């Protein structure tokens, strides 16, 4: 006897009690219509399993039936989910509304977290800041690259600077070093944050999560600026001098700082007009910045069509514009 | 409106129509008890999804609910299958009967085939012969090694000999070269065969399959002997001189041929006694072989406790013993 088990139950989460009790036998021995003996005579269950891909029937006289192994049997079932999921993702893109309550999704484990991290990076349109412990880098190496290729800027914060050869042309890549980081923070387009805690789930420690709550974004944006203040800029790769993107204005300004002197810079910015609240797209020359760390101010001075303006980043209040959507196009080498 | 879709149906393969229509909304927008509006008032469906891991609820006044993405949502569902599958595999091992009708399982694609190949290798207890086109090698490189480590002998047939450094101590590895091979044949312990056709599923070409039918084993064993006759022996790695295993006596004998001269060899064989039909385990010294290719004979002459005997491989009829279970232990270097 197969002897069933609790397994019986779970599978009755989705599975017939006949569809369950026909497969049981075929795995435990492999007959034809002996199945039909223990215990119901109807073979409808077999016509079932055949479509699921859990059984094929082989030339017969009498006809005989055989079960694929758990491994192959579910490999097929998993492959089915992929399709529900992707097709489900695809429709979402064509009909998902935009104004959504903020929330927070906790993750059950390191893998699942990395899954949430990747999902986030995939959506990146402008910049992603990734604070990480050297330990994790090898796990995100491909995703970093893939992202960089969509022309998205990537601001990395790492402790032990790895071998960055793979990256020589891949995109707009900035690398900064910092004493030591414990967990992985990941922020994409100033829109959402995803976090992963060091190594294995370390017993009862902080949870790994994604979140869109302003408080946590503000929290974390502020955290990053602190690590920025002490961090040192080790690698800079402009693989796209005519489309350099930032969501983090302090990163914007860091960059402008390094170049504005030896060449002109042009900008296109979308942002809230602090005076009016209205969204606007602005273009001009960058003719100055202020990056005052104690004063807590970082912004750009943009020469638009009609006068200078100041554009500051997320949560700005004192400049003319608040922006998290920034594009520099770089003037020419000489000057 | 989410607008449902065919997707609705499939998911009703397993999923409630409420459990399906609650998730729909949370993905399309993210509220609390607005769900309850369109269209049923009962929130039992939410208590459902919560256990599936498809939704968490967040601190409320009122209380509010949010859905994980398809990606994470199913990542969790897949992770569940793993457990049904493994737990299901585990029990099988403890209760699966042995005498089973022969059958044949066709595979739907290259991946699934490779899945069947691996599954087979995993079970290897003695030897696996793997005829393969150079193209596939990188896909089986790890599995080859893993297998080699369980102390299992691995007889490879390849066309373009790859870099075999990874393998210097890994096990008992024999490598033979052959002009060109089109598809992957894989035979494990003379018990079952698994086959994969070149590259992508090439439209309407031969199917990829596993099978235990004697005819196909005999077929394929015979096929391999042909490729053996023309093939050349390029690499030989005895990483286990005291336990060298074969299921293919012609491979046995090839080996004995190369060594018997410069050192003694000992054997332990399990096989059918052709005179009596009875199974027996025999041990002795190997004092000779015959490997006559035209005559279609290959066997070993074993000096047992009480006289010489001849042991031939699968399907043997003229020797004293038919064996597919063979272990040589190698005498010492000098002589
Ligand atoms: O940098 C200080 C801190 O204050 C906030 C919130 O009011 O606003 C500043 O942020 C801008 C860039 O993001 C500054 O340039 C601007 O002067 C000011 O609004 C946060 O943004 C920031 O964390
Ligand atoms: O090698 C010939 C061919 O004939 C078979 C089937 O009768 O039997 C031979 O196989 C043995 C090794 O497997 C030989 O040594 C033996 O003499 C003979 O039984 C098949 O085995 C084989 O394909």
JSON list of N, CA and C in Angstrom, two decimals, chain A residues 192-262:
[
{"chain": "A", "resi": 192, "resn": "UNK", "atom": "N", "xyz": [10.49, 53.34, -4.25]},
{"chain": "A", "resi": 192, "resn": "UNK", "atom": "CA", "xyz": [10.31, 52.14, -3.44]},
{"chain": "A", "resi": 192, "resn": "UNK", "atom": "C", "xyz": [11.65, 51.62, -2.94]},
{"chain": "A", "resi": 193, "resn": "UNK", "atom": "N", "xyz": [11.62, 50.89, -1.83]},
{"chain": "A", "resi": 193, "resn": "UNK", "atom": "CA", "xyz": [12.86, 50.43, -1.24]},
{"chain": "A", "resi": 193, "resn": "UNK", "atom": "C", "xyz": [12.77, 48.94, -1.06]},
{"chain": "A", "resi": 194, "resn": "UNK", "atom": "N", "xyz": [13.89, 48.25, -1.23]},
{"chain": "A", "resi": 194, "resn": "UNK", "atom": "CA", "xyz": [13.93, 46.82, -0.94]},
{"chain": "A", "resi": 194, "resn": "UNK", "atom": "C", "xyz": [15.19, 46.51, -0.17]},
{"chain": "A", "resi": 195, "resn": "UNK", "atom": "N", "xyz": [15.04, 45.68, 0.86]},
{"chain": "A", "resi": 195, "resn": "UNK", "atom": "CA", "xyz": [16.09, 45.43, 1.85]},
{"chain": "A", "resi": 195, "resn": "UNK", "atom": "C", "xyz": [16.34, 43.96, 2.12]},
{"chain": "A", "resi": 196, "resn": "UNK", "atom": "N", "xyz": [17.61, 43.59, 2.28]},
{"chain": "A", "resi": 196, "resn": "UNK", "atom": "CA", "xyz": [17.95, 42.21, 2.61]},
{"chain": "A", "resi": 196, "resn": "UNK", "atom": "C", "xyz": [19.01, 42.11, 3.70]},
{"chain": "A", "resi": 197, "resn": "UNK", "atom": "N", "xyz": [18.74, 41.30, 4.73]},
{"chain": "A", "resi": 197, "resn": "UNK", "atom": "CA", "xyz": [19.59, 41.19, 5.93]},
{"chain": "A", "resi": 197, "resn": "UNK", "atom": "C", "xyz": [20.69, 40.12, 5.80]},
{"chain": "A", "resi": 198, "resn": "UNK", "atom": "N", "xyz": [21.84, 40.37, 6.43]},
{"chain": "A", "resi": 198, "resn": "UNK", "atom": "CA", "xyz": [23.10, 39.66, 6.10]},
{"chain": "A", "resi": 198, "resn": "UNK", "atom": "C", "xyz": [23.13, 38.12, 6.17]},
{"chain": "A", "resi": 199, "resn": "UNK", "atom": "N", "xyz": [23.56, 37.51, 5.06]},
{"chain": "A", "resi": 199, "resn": "UNK", "atom": "CA", "xyz": [23.76, 36.06, 4.95]},
{"chain": "A", "resi": 199, "resn": "UNK", "atom": "C", "xyz": [22.45, 35.26, 5.06]},
{"chain": "A", "resi": 200, "resn": "UNK", "atom": "N", "xyz": [22.49, 34.20, 5.85]},
{"chain": "A", "resi": 200, "resn": "UNK", "atom": "CA", "xyz": [21.29, 33.42, 6.15]},
{"chain": "A", "resi": 200, "resn": "UNK", "atom": "C", "xyz": [20.37, 34.25, 7.03]},
{"chain": "A", "resi": 201, "resn": "UNK", "atom": "N", "xyz": [19.08, 33.98, 6.98]},
{"chain": "A", "resi": 201, "resn": "UNK", "atom": "CA", "xyz": [18.18, 34.59, 7.95]},
{"chain": "A", "resi": 201, "resn": "UNK", "atom": "C", "xyz": [18.80, 34.31, 9.32]},
{"chain": "A", "resi": 202, "resn": "UNK", "atom": "N", "xyz": [19.33, 35.35, 9.96]},
{"chain": "A", "resi": 202, "resn": "UNK", "atom": "CA", "xyz": [20.04, 35.18, 11.23]},
{"chain": "A", "resi": 202, "resn": "UNK", "atom": "C", "xyz": [19.10, 35.09, 12.44]},
{"chain": "A", "resi": 203, "resn": "UNK", "atom": "N", "xyz": [18.37, 33.97, 12.54]},
{"chain": "A", "resi": 203, "resn": "UNK", "atom": "CA", "xyz": [17.47, 33.72, 13.66]},
{"chain": "A", "resi": 203, "resn": "UNK", "atom": "C", "xyz": [16.36, 34.77, 13.76]},
{"chain": "A", "resi": 204, "resn": "UNK", "atom": "N", "xyz": [16.34, 35.49, 14.88]},
{"chain": "A", "resi": 204, "resn": "UNK", "atom": "CA", "xyz": [15.37, 36.57, 15.09]},
{"chain": "A", "resi": 204, "resn": "UNK", "atom": "C", "xyz": [16.01, 37.95, 14.95]},
{"chain": "A", "resi": 205, "resn": "UNK", "atom": "N", "xyz": [16.28, 38.34, 13.71]},
{"chain": "A", "resi": 205, "resn": "UNK", "atom": "CA", "xyz": [16.81, 39.65, 13.39]},
{"chain": "A", "resi": 205, "resn": "UNK", "atom": "C", "xyz": [15.87, 40.42, 12.48]},
{"chain": "A", "resi": 206, "resn": "UNK", "atom": "N", "xyz": [16.25, 41.66, 12.11]},
{"chain": "A", "resi": 206, "resn": "UNK", "atom": "CA", "xyz": [15.36, 42.51, 11.31]},
{"chain": "A", "resi": 206, "resn": "UNK", "atom": "C", "xyz": [14.83, 41.76, 10.08]},
{"chain": "A", "resi": 207, "resn": "UNK", "atom": "N", "xyz": [13.61, 42.08, 9.65]},
{"chain": "A", "resi": 207, "resn": "UNK", "atom": "CA", "xyz": [12.99, 41.37, 8.53]},
{"chain": "A", "resi": 207, "resn": "UNK", "atom": "C", "xyz": [13.45, 41.94, 7.19]},
{"chain": "A", "resi": 208, "resn": "UNK", "atom": "N", "xyz": [13.47, 41.12, 6.14]},
{"chain": "A", "resi": 208, "resn": "UNK", "atom": "CA", "xyz": [13.75, 41.61, 4.80]},
{"chain": "A", "resi": 208, "resn": "UNK", "atom": "C", "xyz": [12.43, 42.01, 4.15]},
{"chain": "A", "resi": 209, "resn": "UNK", "atom": "N", "xyz": [12.41, 43.15, 3.48]},
{"chain": "A", "resi": 209, "resn": "UNK", "atom": "CA", "xyz": [11.14, 43.66, 2.98]},
{"chain": "A", "resi": 209, "resn": "UNK", "atom": "C", "xyz": [11.29, 44.60, 1.79]},
{"chain": "A", "resi": 210, "resn": "UNK", "atom": "N", "xyz": [10.19, 44.79, 1.07]},
{"chain": "A", "resi": 210, "resn": "UNK", "atom": "CA", "xyz": [10.07, 45.85, 0.10]},
{"chain": "A", "resi": 210, "resn": "UNK", "atom": "C", "xyz": [9.08, 46.82, 0.69]},
{"chain": "A", "resi": 211, "resn": "UNK", "atom": "N", "xyz": [9.13, 48.08, 0.28]},
{"chain": "A", "resi": 211, "resn": "UNK", "atom": "CA", "xyz": [8.13, 49.02, 0.76]},
{"chain": "A", "resi": 211, "resn": "UNK", "atom": "C", "xyz": [8.08, 50.31, -0.05]},
{"chain": "A", "resi": 212, "resn": "UNK", "atom": "N", "xyz": [6.89, 50.92, -0.07]},
{"chain": "A", "resi": 212, "resn": "UNK", "atom": "CA", "xyz": [6.67, 52.15, -0.82]},
{"chain": "A", "resi": 212, "resn": "UNK", "atom": "C", "xyz": [6.22, 53.28, 0.08]},
{"chain": "A", "resi": 213, "resn": "UNK", "atom": "N", "xyz": [6.08, 53.00, 1.37]},
{"chain": "A", "resi": 213, "resn": "UNK", "atom": "CA", "xyz": [5.72, 54.01, 2.37]},
{"chain": "A", "resi": 213, "resn": "UNK", "atom": "C", "xyz": [6.67, 55.19, 2.30]},
{"chain": "A", "resi": 214, "resn": "UNK", "atom": "N", "xyz": [6.14, 56.40, 2.12]},
{"chain": "A", "resi": 214, "resn": "UNK", "atom": "CA", "xyz": [7.09, 57.52, 2.16]},
{"chain": "A", "resi": 214, "resn": "UNK", "atom": "C", "xyz": [8.04, 57.50, 3.35]},
{"chain": "A", "resi": 215, "resn": "UNK", "atom": "N", "xyz": [7.55, 57.23, 4.55]},
{"chain": "A", "resi": 215, "resn": "UNK", "atom": "CA", "xyz": [8.41, 57.28, 5.73]},
{"chain": "A", "resi": 215, "resn": "UNK", "atom": "C", "xyz": [9.70, 56.47, 5.57]},
{"chain": "A", "resi": 216, "resn": "UNK", "atom": "N", "xyz": [9.58, 55.29, 4.96]},
{"chain": "A", "resi": 216, "resn": "UNK", "atom": "CA", "xyz": [10.72, 54.39, 4.85]},
{"chain": "A", "resi": 216, "resn": "UNK", "atom": "C", "xyz": [11.64, 54.85, 3.72]},
{"chain": "A", "resi": 217, "resn": "UNK", "atom": "N", "xyz": [11.04, 55.44, 2.70]},
{"chain": "A", "resi": 217, "resn": "UNK", "atom": "CA", "xyz": [11.84, 56.01, 1.62]},
{"chain": "A", "resi": 217, "resn": "UNK", "atom": "C", "xyz": [12.62, 57.18, 2.20]},
{"chain": "A", "resi": 218, "resn": "UNK", "atom": "N", "xyz": [11.91, 58.12, 2.82]},
{"chain": "A", "resi": 218, "resn": "UNK", "atom": "CA", "xyz": [12.58, 59.24, 3.49]},
{"chain": "A", "resi": 218, "resn": "UNK", "atom": "C", "xyz": [13.65, 58.77, 4.47]},
{"chain": "A", "resi": 219, "resn": "UNK", "atom": "N", "xyz": [13.25, 57.91, 5.40]},
{"chain": "A", "resi": 219, "resn": "UNK", "atom": "CA", "xyz": [14.21, 57.25, 6.24]},
{"chain": "A", "resi": 219, "resn": "UNK", "atom": "C", "xyz": [15.45, 56.87, 5.42]},
{"chain": "A", "resi": 220, "resn": "UNK", "atom": "N", "xyz": [15.26, 55.95, 4.47]},
{"chain": "A", "resi": 220, "resn": "UNK", "atom": "CA", "xyz": [16.37, 55.31, 3.76]},
{"chain": "A", "resi": 220, "resn": "UNK", "atom": "C", "xyz": [17.15, 56.26, 2.85]},
{"chain": "A", "resi": 221, "resn": "UNK", "atom": "N", "xyz": [16.45, 57.22, 2.25]},
{"chain": "A", "resi": 221, "resn": "UNK", "atom": "CA", "xyz": [17.12, 58.20, 1.41]},
{"chain": "A", "resi": 221, "resn": "UNK", "atom": "C", "xyz": [18.10, 58.93, 2.30]},
{"chain": "A", "resi": 222, "resn": "UNK", "atom": "N", "xyz": [17.61, 59.30, 3.48]},
{"chain": "A", "resi": 222, "resn": "UNK", "atom": "CA", "xyz": [18.42, 60.01, 4.46]},
{"chain": "A", "resi": 222, "resn": "UNK", "atom": "C", "xyz": [19.59, 59.17, 4.94]},
{"chain": "A", "resi": 223, "resn": "UNK", "atom": "N", "xyz": [19.32, 57.90, 5.22]},
{"chain": "A", "resi": 223, "resn": "UNK", "atom": "CA", "xyz": [20.39, 56.96, 5.56]},
{"chain": "A", "resi": 223, "resn": "UNK", "atom": "C", "xyz": [21.51, 56.97, 4.51]},
{"chain": "A", "resi": 224, "resn": "UNK", "atom": "N", "xyz": [21.12, 56.86, 3.24]},
{"chain": "A", "resi": 224, "resn": "UNK", "atom": "CA", "xyz": [22.06, 56.80, 2.12]},
{"chain": "A", "resi": 224, "resn": "UNK", "atom": "C", "xyz": [22.95, 58.06, 2.03]},
{"chain": "A", "resi": 225, "resn": "UNK", "atom": "N", "xyz": [22.32, 59.22, 2.19]},
{"chain": "A", "resi": 225, "resn": "UNK", "atom": "CA", "xyz": [23.06, 60.47, 2.23]},
{"chain": "A", "resi": 225, "resn": "UNK", "atom": "C", "xyz": [24.14, 60.43, 3.32]},
{"chain": "A", "resi": 226, "resn": "UNK", "atom": "N", "xyz": [23.85, 59.78, 4.45]},
{"chain": "A", "resi": 226, "resn": "UNK", "atom": "CA", "xyz": [24.86, 59.68, 5.51]},
{"chain": "A", "resi": 226, "resn": "UNK", "atom": "C", "xyz": [26.02, 58.84, 5.03]},
{"chain": "A", "resi": 227, "resn": "UNK", "atom": "N", "xyz": [25.75, 57.62, 4.55]},
{"chain": "A", "resi": 227, "resn": "UNK", "atom": "CA", "xyz": [26.79, 56.77, 3.98]},
{"chain": "A", "resi": 227, "resn": "UNK", "atom": "C", "xyz": [27.55, 57.45, 2.83]},
{"chain": "A", "resi": 228, "resn": "UNK", "atom": "N", "xyz": [26.84, 58.29, 2.07]},
{"chain": "A", "resi": 228, "resn": "UNK", "atom": "CA", "xyz": [27.44, 59.11, 1.01]},
{"chain": "A", "resi": 228, "resn": "UNK", "atom": "C", "xyz": [28.50, 60.08, 1.53]},
{"chain": "A", "resi": 229, "resn": "UNK", "atom": "N", "xyz": [28.30, 60.59, 2.75]},
{"chain": "A", "resi": 229, "resn": "UNK", "atom": "CA", "xyz": [29.14, 61.67, 3.29]},
{"chain": "A", "resi": 229, "resn": "UNK", "atom": "C", "xyz": [30.49, 61.14, 3.69]},
{"chain": "A", "resi": 230, "resn": "UNK", "atom": "N", "xyz": [30.55, 59.84, 3.96]},
{"chain": "A", "resi": 230, "resn": "UNK", "atom": "CA", "xyz": [31.76, 59.25, 4.49]},
{"chain": "A", "resi": 230, "resn": "UNK", "atom": "C", "xyz": [32.39, 58.39, 3.43]},
{"chain": "A", "resi": 231, "resn": "UNK", "atom": "N", "xyz": [31.58, 57.98, 2.47]},
{"chain": "A", "resi": 231, "resn": "UNK", "atom": "CA", "xyz": [32.01, 57.09, 1.39]},
{"chain": "A", "resi": 231, "resn": "UNK", "atom": "C", "xyz": [32.96, 57.76, 0.43]},
{"chain": "A", "resi": 232, "resn": "UNK", "atom": "N", "xyz": [33.80, 56.96, -0.21]},
{"chain": "A", "resi": 232, "resn": "UNK", "atom": "CA", "xyz": [34.72, 57.50, -1.19]},
{"chain": "A", "resi": 232, "resn": "UNK", "atom": "C", "xyz": [34.45, 56.95, -2.62]},
{"chain": "A", "resi": 233, "resn": "UNK", "atom": "N", "xyz": [34.59, 57.82, -3.63]},
{"chain": "A", "resi": 233, "resn": "UNK", "atom": "CA", "xyz": [34.22, 57.52, -5.01]},
{"chain": "A", "resi": 233, "resn": "UNK", "atom": "C", "xyz": [35.32, 56.77, -5.76]},
{"chain": "A", "resi": 234, "resn": "UNK", "atom": "N", "xyz": [35.16, 55.47, -5.92]},
{"chain": "A", "resi": 234, "resn": "UNK", "atom": "CA", "xyz": [36.26, 54.68, -6.44]},
{"chain": "A", "resi": 234, "resn": "UNK", "atom": "C", "xyz": [36.23, 54.44, -7.94]},
{"chain": "A", "resi": 235, "resn": "UNK", "atom": "N", "xyz": [35.04, 54.29, -8.52]},
{"chain": "A", "resi": 235, "resn": "UNK", "atom": "CA", "xyz": [34.94, 54.06, -9.95]},
{"chain": "A", "resi": 235, "resn": "UNK", "atom": "C", "xyz": [33.83, 54.90, -10.59]},
{"chain": "A", "resi": 236, "resn": "UNK", "atom": "N", "xyz": [34.12, 55.46, -11.76]},
{"chain": "A", "resi": 236, "resn": "UNK", "atom": "CA", "xyz": [33.14, 56.24, -12.52]},
{"chain": "A", "resi": 236, "resn": "UNK", "atom": "C", "xyz": [33.14, 55.89, -14.00]},
{"chain": "A", "resi": 237, "resn": "UNK", "atom": "N", "xyz": [32.03, 55.36, -14.50]},
{"chain": "A", "resi": 237, "resn": "UNK", "atom": "CA", "xyz": [31.95, 54.89, -15.88]},
{"chain": "A", "resi": 237, "resn": "UNK", "atom": "C", "xyz": [30.76, 55.50, -16.62]},
{"chain": "A", "resi": 238, "resn": "UNK", "atom": "N", "xyz": [31.02, 56.52, -17.42]},
{"chain": "A", "resi": 238, "resn": "UNK", "atom": "CA", "xyz": [29.96, 57.14, -18.21]},
{"chain": "A", "resi": 238, "resn": "UNK", "atom": "C", "xyz": [29.88, 56.48, -19.58]},
{"chain": "A", "resi": 239, "resn": "UNK", "atom": "N", "xyz": [29.15, 55.38, -19.67]},
{"chain": "A", "resi": 239, "resn": "UNK", "atom": "CA", "xyz": [29.01, 54.70, -20.94]},
{"chain": "A", "resi": 239, "resn": "UNK", "atom": "C", "xyz": [27.89, 55.24, -21.82]},
{"chain": "A", "resi": 240, "resn": "UNK", "atom": "N", "xyz": [27.48, 56.48, -21.55]},
{"chain": "A", "resi": 240, "resn": "UNK", "atom": "CA", "xyz": [26.29, 57.08, -22.17]},
{"chain": "A", "resi": 240, "resn": "UNK", "atom": "C", "xyz": [26.26, 58.58, -21.83]},
{"chain": "A", "resi": 241, "resn": "UNK", "atom": "N", "xyz": [27.24, 59.33, -22.33]},
{"chain": "A", "resi": 241, "resn": "UNK", "atom": "CA", "xyz": [27.48, 60.74, -22.00]},
{"chain": "A", "resi": 241, "resn": "UNK", "atom": "C", "xyz": [26.34, 61.68, -22.41]},
{"chain": "A", "resi": 242, "resn": "UNK", "atom": "N", "xyz": [25.39, 61.18, -23.19]},
{"chain": "A", "resi": 242, "resn": "UNK", "atom": "CA", "xyz": [24.33, 62.02, -23.72]},
{"chain": "A", "resi": 242, "resn": "UNK", "atom": "C", "xyz": [22.99, 61.71, -23.04]},
{"chain": "A", "resi": 243, "resn": "UNK", "atom": "N", "xyz": [23.03, 60.75, -22.12]},
{"chain": "A", "resi": 243, "resn": "UNK", "atom": "CA", "xyz": [21.88, 60.38, -21.33]},
{"chain": "A", "resi": 243, "resn": "UNK", "atom": "C", "xyz": [22.36, 59.82, -20.00]},
{"chain": "A", "resi": 244, "resn": "UNK", "atom": "N", "xyz": [22.73, 60.72, -19.08]},
{"chain": "A", "resi": 244, "resn": "UNK", "atom": "CA", "xyz": [23.06, 60.33, -17.71]},
{"chain": "A", "resi": 244, "resn": "UNK", "atom": "C", "xyz": [21.91, 60.64, -16.75]},
{"chain": "A", "resi": 245, "resn": "UNK", "atom": "N", "xyz": [21.39, 59.59, -16.13]},
{"chain": "A", "resi": 245, "resn": "UNK", "atom": "CA", "xyz": [20.17, 59.71, -15.35]},
{"chain": "A", "resi": 245, "resn": "UNK", "atom": "C", "xyz": [20.40, 59.57, -13.84]},
{"chain": "A", "resi": 246, "resn": "UNK", "atom": "N", "xyz": [19.65, 60.33, -13.07]},
{"chain": "A", "resi": 246, "resn": "UNK", "atom": "CA", "xyz": [19.67, 60.22, -11.63]},
{"chain": "A", "resi": 246, "resn": "UNK", "atom": "C", "xyz": [18.26, 60.35, -11.10]},
{"chain": "A", "resi": 247, "resn": "UNK", "atom": "N", "xyz": [17.97, 59.67, -9.99]},
{"chain": "A", "resi": 247, "resn": "UNK", "atom": "CA", "xyz": [16.79, 60.02, -9.22]},
{"chain": "A", "resi": 247, "resn": "UNK", "atom": "C", "xyz": [17.20, 60.71, -7.93]},
{"chain": "A", "resi": 248, "resn": "UNK", "atom": "N", "xyz": [18.46, 60.52, -7.56]},
{"chain": "A", "resi": 248, "resn": "UNK", "atom": "CA", "xyz": [18.97, 61.12, -6.36]},
{"chain": "A", "resi": 248, "resn": "UNK", "atom": "C", "xyz": [19.80, 62.37, -6.65]},
{"chain": "A", "resi": 249, "resn": "UNK", "atom": "N", "xyz": [19.21, 63.53, -6.41]},
{"chain": "A", "resi": 249, "resn": "UNK", "atom": "CA", "xyz": [19.87, 64.80, -6.70]},
{"chain": "A", "resi": 249, "resn": "UNK", "atom": "C", "xyz": [21.24, 64.97, -6.08]},
{"chain": "A", "resi": 250, "resn": "UNK", "atom": "N", "xyz": [21.48, 64.37, -4.92]},
{"chain": "A", "resi": 250, "resn": "UNK", "atom": "CA", "xyz": [22.80, 64.49, -4.34]},
{"chain": "A", "resi": 250, "resn": "UNK", "atom": "C", "xyz": [23.83, 63.77, -5.20]},
{"chain": "A", "resi": 251, "resn": "UNK", "atom": "N", "xyz": [23.43, 62.64, -5.78]},
{"chain": "A", "resi": 251, "resn": "UNK", "atom": "CA", "xyz": [24.26, 61.96, -6.79]},
{"chain": "A", "resi": 251, "resn": "UNK", "atom": "C", "xyz": [24.40, 62.82, -8.06]},
{"chain": "A", "resi": 252, "resn": "UNK", "atom": "N", "xyz": [23.28, 63.38, -8.52]},
{"chain": "A", "resi": 252, "resn": "UNK", "atom": "CA", "xyz": [23.31, 64.37, -9.58]},
{"chain": "A", "resi": 252, "resn": "UNK", "atom": "C", "xyz": [24.45, 65.31, -9.29]},
{"chain": "A", "resi": 253, "resn": "UNK", "atom": "N", "xyz": [24.28, 66.08, -8.23]},
{"chain": "A", "resi": 253, "resn": "UNK", "atom": "CA", "xyz": [25.21, 67.14, -7.88]},
{"chain": "A", "resi": 253, "resn": "UNK", "atom": "C", "xyz": [26.64, 66.67, -7.67]},
{"chain": "A", "resi": 254, "resn": "UNK", "atom": "N", "xyz": [26.82, 65.47, -7.15]},
{"chain": "A", "resi": 254, "resn": "UNK", "atom": "CA", "xyz": [28.18, 65.00, -6.97]},
{"chain": "A", "resi": 254, "resn": "UNK", "atom": "C", "xyz": [28.83, 65.04, -8.33]},
{"chain": "A", "resi": 255, "resn": "UNK", "atom": "N", "xyz": [28.22, 64.32, -9.27]},
{"chain": "A", "resi": 255, "resn": "UNK", "atom": "CA", "xyz": [28.64, 64.32, -10.67]},
{"chain": "A", "resi": 255, "resn": "UNK", "atom": "C", "xyz": [28.84, 65.74, -11.25]},
{"chain": "A", "resi": 256, "resn": "UNK", "atom": "N", "xyz": [27.82, 66.58, -11.24]},
{"chain": "A", "resi": 256, "resn": "UNK", "atom": "CA", "xyz": [28.04, 67.90, -11.79]},
{"chain": "A", "resi": 256, "resn": "UNK", "atom": "C", "xyz": [29.32, 68.50, -11.24]},
{"chain": "A", "resi": 257, "resn": "UNK", "atom": "N", "xyz": [29.53, 68.33, -9.93]},
{"chain": "A", "resi": 257, "resn": "UNK", "atom": "CA", "xyz": [30.67, 68.90, -9.23]},
{"chain": "A", "resi": 257, "resn": "UNK", "atom": "C", "xyz": [31.97, 68.50, -9.90]},
{"chain": "A", "resi": 258, "resn": "UNK", "atom": "N", "xyz": [32.09, 67.23, -10.22]},
{"chain": "A", "resi": 258, "resn": "UNK", "atom": "CA", "xyz": [33.32, 66.72, -10.81]},
{"chain": "A", "resi": 258, "resn": "UNK", "atom": "C", "xyz": [33.62, 67.19, -12.23]},
{"chain": "A", "resi": 259, "resn": "UNK", "atom": "N", "xyz": [32.61, 67.70, -12.94]},
{"chain": "A", "resi": 259, "resn": "UNK", "atom": "CA", "xyz": [32.75, 68.01, -14.37]},
{"chain": "A", "resi": 259, "resn": "UNK", "atom": "C", "xyz": [32.46, 69.44, -14.79]},
{"chain": "A", "resi": 260, "resn": "UNK", "atom": "N", "xyz": [31.43, 70.02, -14.20]},
{"chain": "A", "resi": 260, "resn": "UNK", "atom": "CA", "xyz": [30.98, 71.32, -14.64]},
{"chain": "A", "resi": 260, "resn": "UNK", "atom": "C", "xyz": [32.15, 72.22, -14.99]},
{"chain": "A", "resi": 261, "resn": "UNK", "atom": "N", "xyz": [33.30, 71.95, -14.39]},
{"chain": "A", "resi": 261, "resn": "UNK", "atom": "CA", "xyz": [34.45, 72.83, -14.52]},
{"chain": "A", "resi": 261, "resn": "UNK", "atom": "C", "xyz": [35.16, 72.64, -15.85]},
{"chain": "A", "resi": 262, "resn": "UNK", "atom": "N", "xyz": [35.37, 71.39, -16.23]},
{"chain": "A", "resi": 262, "resn": "UNK", "atom": "CA", "xyz": [36.09, 71.07, -17.46]},
{"chain": "A", "resi": 262, "resn": "UNK", "atom": "C", "xyz": [35.18, 70.79, -18.68]}
]
